[model samples]
Target: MAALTRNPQFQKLLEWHRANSANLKLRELFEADPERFNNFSLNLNTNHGHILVDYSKNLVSKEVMQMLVELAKSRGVEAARDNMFSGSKINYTEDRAVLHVALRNRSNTPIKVDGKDVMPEVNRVLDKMKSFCQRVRSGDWKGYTGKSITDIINIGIGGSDLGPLMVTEALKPYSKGGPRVWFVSNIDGTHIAKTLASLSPETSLFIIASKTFTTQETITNAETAKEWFLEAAKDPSAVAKHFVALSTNTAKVKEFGIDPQNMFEFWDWVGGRYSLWSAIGLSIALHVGFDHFEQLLSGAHWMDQHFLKTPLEKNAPVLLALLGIWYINCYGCETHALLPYDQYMHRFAAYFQQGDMESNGKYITKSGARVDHQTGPIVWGEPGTNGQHAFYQLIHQGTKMIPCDFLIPVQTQHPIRKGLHHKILLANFLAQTEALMKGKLPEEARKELQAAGKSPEDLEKLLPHKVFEGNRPTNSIVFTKLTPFILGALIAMYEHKIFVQGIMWDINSFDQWGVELGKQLAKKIEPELEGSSAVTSHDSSTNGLISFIKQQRDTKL
Candidate 1:
C-alpha cells in the first residue's frame, strides 16, 4: 500500500479540487439545484428514531464527491472496512483487531478473532454487567452498614472517564432510580478529595475503571478511595462490597482488595476511546439502566450496519470523512467546529476533540514515512448560543477557513410551554447554518449601512468590515431527539468518520504511540519531584525548572 499522496487518484483529486474550490459556493449550489438537499443528504433510520444529515451546505460538487470516493477506493477503503468487520488485525502496530462493533452485536451473530468466536465471551460479560447493575439499581445490592447504595463515583481517566461521563451527563433525563453518578479523572488531589467529601462511605459505591489496573492517575485515585473507605469501615474486607473493578487484571484487582469475581472484562480489540460500548460503560449502564444501555448498543449496531452496507456516495460517515478531507487537504481549512445546539450535548465537541484529533493527528504513515499532506483538522467548538457570543464572530468574519458541523435536535427532552423554548433554539440553529452558507455580500452590507443613515465615506470605511464571504461550509445533523439510542448512533457516526479518514490518510488510527512519550517522561520526572532523588542530567531548561521548583518549595513562599 502506497501513501495517499503517492496514489494517482489522489493526485487527480488534488488537481480537480484545486480547480473548483475557489469558485464553488454553497449559496449558488443550493440555488442552482431544486433537489440539492435531497440529493446531497443521507438518512439514518435507527430502532429508536431517525436522523437526517444535510451535506448540501458543504463545499462539494458532484464531480468532487465522485473523485473523493474514487480516491477512497484507490486507497482501499472498502477493503479496510471489510477487513475490520471480518476481524482482521488491521491495527498492525498494536497487533489487535479493531472490533468494538462486536461488543454491540445485538443479533448474537458470530464474530471471529483468531478463528474463535468472541460473541459468547462478549455476551457473558454483558450479562454479568446487566445483573450487577440491576442489583444495584433495585436496592438488592447494599453497602456495608446495610444501606442501599445512594451514590456512585467512577474513577478513571481518558476514555474511561470521558465516554461514560459525557453519556451520563447527556442522558440525565433517562435516569430513573439509579444513584447519582460522579466522575473523578484528574490526578490532582483536589478532584478526588472534593468528590469524596460529599459522600458517605456506607452508602456510596466506587467503580474503578482501569483496563490494566495500572493507569497512574486511576490507580492513585483508587488507592486513595480505598483508604477513605477503610477509614469508616475499619475492615479491609468491606472493599469487596463497596468497590468493583472494570478491568481484566484479575490478580491485580484481587490484590487491591476488590474481589476478582466483581471485575468485568473486555478484550484488547476494544480501544480505550471506543470502549464505552464494552464493560467500560458500566457506569453508563448503572446510571441509565441496562435496558437503555442495550438500546444504546442497538443504535450503534444500526449505524455499523449502515456504514458497512451503504454505498460510499450515500453513506453518512463516508461523505463526512471525504468532506473533511476536501477542506483540510484541498481548501486548506485547518479547524473543524462541532457545534451542538442542545445543552445536553455540551460535551459532544470536547468528546470528539479527543476522538478525532487523537485518532488522526498523525504525521507518520503506515509505511513509516512522514506525510506530506495535512491529515486531521483541529476539532473543536462549544454549544451554540454560547459559542455565538464567544467565537462565532471569528468564524463569520475571520481570515481562516473553518468547516463546521451544526447539530440540532428537533425535539427537546424538557419542553417549556409545549414548544416555545425549543423553537427558539431551533430558530437559532437554522439561522446560524443559513448565515454561514449565505453570508452578507458587500452590496448587502452597503445597503444596510446606507439604510442606517451612515454617510458615504463612513459606509465605505465600514463596508469591508461588515461584508461576509458566505462560502463557509457547514453540515446540519438534525435528529428527532436526544435519546440514549440517538447519542449512541451519533457517536458511532463520528467514530466511523474517524476510521474512514484514517483509511484515506493511510495512517493507523487505532494505536496511540504519541501519548506514550509523555507518560515515559512523567515516569522519569516524578522521582525528581520527590526529595529522594536529584536531577543532575537533563536539558538545561528542565534542570533549571526543577531547581526553581525545589527552591520555591524550600523557601515556603
Candidate 2:
C-alpha cells in the first residue's frame, strides 16, 4: 500500500533484518566495537544543559544503521520535513499547513504559510503572553475582587489539556511566584467539580483553551467553571475579568463573556497535538513565568534546527525515527515505552499518548488505501523505578520485544539527603537499560543458580525462570538537567520523531479524524441517557450499557 515498502533500501533493510537481525545481540555488538555509542548516538547542546542520546544498546549494526538512514532518505523524509517547514499544506486532508515549528521558530525567521510570513504573528502572541504573564504574576492584572490570580484552571481537552498540564507539572521547579495551575479537561462533573472545590472565585482565573472555542468537552468544562464562578461573583461580567480564551473564535469568545482582547489567537497551521508552543501554552507561561516559557520555546527551536539541518545519520530525531521504523516496521514490535527517570516528568509518556498515538495511529495511507503494514505502535509508560516495579518484568521476559526509550537527567531538580535518591535512580536507569540490552544468559543463570546451593532439580526448575533473553532494545537519553529548555527540546525531539514515522508510513499525522466519531456518537446518545431507554438503535453492547446507566441514574450521587 505504500511505495516506501517497495523502495530498494526498504526491501534491503527488511531482508537484512530477517537474516542477521536475529543473532545481532547488543552485547556482542558492543564487544566487537568500542566506539559503538559514539557512532550510534549524537549530542545536542541546549541552553539549559547538554543532551546525550545514546542509542547504541539497540540491536542495530553499522550496516543496519546505514540501511535505515538510506530507507529514511528513500522514503522522502527530507522532502516531507522540508514541505512541512515550507508550509506546503502537508496536512493534505485538511488542506492546511502543519507548522508547529513556526510557533517555536525562535530565530524569527520568516516562514510563510500562504505568501505571508507567520513568524510575526507567532512572536506577537508570544509577546502578548509575556505581557499578560508579567502583569498577572506582578498582581497588575486583577480578578473581580481585584486580587491577584492565585489559581489558574486551564480548561481544555486533548492537546489543550495534556500539553499544558504535562509542562506545568514537569517544570514545577521553574515556577517561582506564579499562580498554582490546575487543569479541568474531562466533561465528567467530577473533574471540574473537584478542581473548583478548593479554589476561591476571588483569586481564580480560568484559561479556556480550545482552538475552535467549540470543542465539546472544553466548552462544557468552561461553562461549568463559569457557572461556579458566577455563583460566587453574583454577576456575569465577572467572567470577563476572571476568564480568558486560547481560541480563534471571536464570536464565541465574546458570547461566553470573555473580552476580545483576552482571547489569544493561534493559527490553523497548528494542530491540537502540536499546539503547546502557541497560545495554548498560556497556562504554561502563566504558571512558570514567561521567561522560562521562552526558554522552553528556545529549546524546541534548537531541536528543530538540528532535525532540519543535520543529516539523517547524525540527527537524533531521525536516528530515533529510523530505529522506531526498524523495530516497529521491521522487527514487528508493537509498543514503544517512554520511561522518564525523573519524578517531575511523570506525565511525559501520558502527554505523548496524544502527541504520538493520535498523530500516527491511522491505518490508512494518504491515498485512502489501508496500509499493508502496521503504522504507529502503542506508546505507553510511566516514570522509571515505579514503572520498573510495575511492568519492567514484562519488558524483561515477555514474548513481545517492546522497544523503550529511557530518559534520565544527570542533575535532578532536587538532590536530597546527599543526593542518595538521585544517585540510586540514575543507577536504576543505567542498570535497567544494560540488563534489558544484555539479559541473563543460560550459562550465567545456571551458574548463579548453582552458586546459591540449590539442588540440581531445583536448579533446572528455576533456570528457565531465571533466564532473561537479552537483546531487548532500549535507547538511553541523558541530559544535564530537567530545566525548561531541556524539557522543551526532549518534547520537540519526540514531535519530530513522530512526524518522521508518519512520513515513512505515508499517513497524514496532522489530522485526527479518529477522535471525532466517538464524540459525534456520544452526542446522539446523550438525550437517550436522560430517560430509562433501551437504546435499540445502537448495538447490543452499547444499548446494554445505555440501559444499565439509565437504570442507575436514580441512585445516590
Candidate 3:
C-alpha cells in the first residue's frame, strides 16, 4: 500500500487525470451540460434532520467520482476500516487500538481493548462529566466565595482547545444563557494576561485540561492563572475554589492545587484529536448543558454506525477520502480551503488544520516504508463573507490549485433579520461554488468587458488575471440548522474522512511521531539559550544560534 501509486489502476487514474487536467474549463463544463446542478447534488436525510450537498460544481464529472471510488476500493480501504472498528490495533506504531468511536459508543455494545470491554468505564466517566457540568451550569456548583459561575475558563492546547472551542462557538445559540466561556491555550504571557484581566476571581472557574496534567502549554497557563488568582484574591488556599482539572493524573492534578473532587478524568484510548467525546468535553457540556451535549454525541454516534455498517462504495467518508486522494495525489493540489459560509462554524478550518495535518503529515508508512508521494494538503480558510473581503480574490484569480469545501446550513439557528442575512450569505456561498466550477471564458469575458467599454490592450493584459480557470473543485455541505447533533455528525464525518485517507496511504494517522524530533531539539537548545547549562549535544547550526542568543541576552535588556 505504501507504493499505491504503482498499483495499475492507481497509475491509470493518475495518467488519466494528467491528460484531462485543464482540458475542460469550468465555463465549458457548465455550458456543455444544461442539467449539471440537478445531476451533481445529493439530498441526505439523517432522520433527525437533512443536508443538501452541492458537489456538482467540482472539477470532476460522474466518471471521475466513479474512478475515485474504485481507487479507494482497490486500496483495500474497507478491510482497513473494518480492522479499525474491530479494535484490531490499526495504529501499529503506538501499538494502541484506535478507538475514538468508542467515545460515542452509546449502544452499550462491548468494544474490547486488550480483551476487556471498555464501554463501562467510558460511559462511567461520561456520566460523571455530565453530572458535574449540569451542577455547574444549573448554578448548584458555586465558586469558593459562594458566587455563581459567571465565567468559565478552559485552559488547554491543541485538541483540548480546538474541539471544545469549535463546538462551543458553533452551538452558542443553544447555550441557554450559560456562563461566558473563555479558552486559554497558548503559553504566551499576553494570552494569560488578557484572559485573567476580565473577571473577578470569585465568580470565575478555570478548567485545566491536560491528560497528564503536565502539558507544557496547558500547565504553564494553569500555573500562571493560579498565581494571578492568589495575588488578586489575596488567598493562596482559594486556588482550590476556582480551579478544576480535566486530567487522568489525579495525583498531579491535586498537586497542582486543584481539588481532587473537581478533577474530571478521561482515558488513554481517547487520542487528543478525538477526545471530545470523552471527559475533555466538559467545557462543551458546560456551555450547552448535558442534554444538548448528548445530542452532539448522538449525532456522531449515528455517523459512527453508518461508517461502520455502510459498504465502501456507498460510504460518505469513503467517497470523501477518494476525492481527496484525487486532488492531493493525482492532480498535485497542495492546499485545501475550508470556507464555512455559516458564521457559527468559523473555527472549522483551524479545527481541521490540526485534525488533518497532525494526523496524515507523515513521510513514513505504518510499515516504516519511506513513501515517495505527497500526503496531506495544507488545510486553511476563514469564515465566508469575512473571507470574501480578504483572500477570495487570490482564490478566484490566483495561479495555484486550491480545492475548497464550502460548508453552509440551509438556515442559521440564530438567523439575523429573520433569515435575510442567511439567504444572501448562502446565495454568495452557492454562487462562489458555481463560479469556481464554471469560470468566465476568455472570449466570453473579453466580450463582456468590451461591451462594458474596455479598450483592447488593457483587456488583454487584465484578461489573463481576470480569467478564472474554472474546474476548481468544491463541495457544499448544506444542513437544516446547526444543532449539536448536526455539528457532531459533521465533525465525525471529517474524522472518518481523515482515517479513511490514512488507511489508503498506509500511514498511522493516530500516532504523531513527527512532533517528537522537534520537541527533542527544543529541549536540547533550552538550557543553552537560558544560560543555565553549557550547550552540548547540538547540531552545528543550532549550537551557533544558541551561542548568539546567549551573548545577546547576557548583554541586553
Candidate 2 ranges with C-alpha deviation above 4 Å = none
lDDT tens per residue, model 2, 1-557: 46666578888888888888778878888888899988888777765689999999988888888888888888889999999999899998899999999998888878997799998888888888999899889988888988888898899998888899999999998888888999998888999989988999999988999988998888888888888888899997777889889986788888778898898999898999899999999999999999999989989989999899998889999989999999988888889999999889999999999999999999888777788888888999999889999998888988788989999999988899999999899999999999988888999999998899999999999899999988888999999988888888999999999999999898999998887889898889888887664789988999898888888878998
Ranking by TM-score: 2, 1, 3
lDDT of 3 by residue, 439-468 (tens): 777888888788878888877877776676
Cα distance off (Å), candidate 2, residue 164: 0.6
TM-score of each model, paired residue for residue: 0.97, 0.98, 0.93
Stretches of candidate 3 exceeding 4 Å from the true structure? 22-25, 31-39, 232-238, 455-463, 531-557
- Which parts of model 1 are misplaced by more than 4 Å? 532-535, 554-557
Better of 1 and 3 by TM-score: 1
- Clash number for each model: 0, 0, 1
Q: Which window of ten consecutive residues has the lowest lDDT sum in model 1?
A: 548-557
Clashing pairs in 2: none
**Alpha-carbon error at 383 in model 2, in Å?**
0.5
